[PDB]
Amino acid sequence: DLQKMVMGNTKPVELILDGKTVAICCATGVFGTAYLVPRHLFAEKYDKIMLDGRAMTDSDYRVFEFEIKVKGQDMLSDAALMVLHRGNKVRDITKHFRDTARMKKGTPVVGVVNNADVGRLIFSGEALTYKDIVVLMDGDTMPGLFAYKAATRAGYAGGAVLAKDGADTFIVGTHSAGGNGVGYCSCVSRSMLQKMKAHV
């Protein structure tokens, strides 16, 4: 139900630069015309963002960023919200997120993917541990990540990761980086989504 629900909200994203596809990733719609996407996505050089086959330019949407408290100072989550101005509504699924690491080391985790690279797909692994600040292979760093044992690949960024709190299935947040047996998703707070929705 939920997994079938989130797959429905997952759209393929392509970055276009001079008629060529320069970047591929995913997008997870949470409500209205708002989607959760990798923030490091906009760090790339593009002139058009393809969302579900629809080409758009920067004046077509707004990107709000989430800031998370990590040891006093606040940092920028790799989970960015892309709110389109005009667009086909998606199924509001915010009520399926939560406000804390409501998981437990070793619980069923499922990543939902849908991009131009491997089409629609599901990857399943084990919940590992929560991470305050993870340092990437390119020397960069990301806040509020959740670690897990799962076979992930480039392009899976932006896909929703869901666990099993009790007999409940809840969306943890979006996939950002993966390396060597362990995938990492950028955790998104349920509260954070609600205010953002009231905000828009």
Partner: peptide, 9 residues
Amino acid sequence: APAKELLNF
């Protein structure tokens, strides 16, 4: 060391 899993060309 995990790498950002966006697909770059």
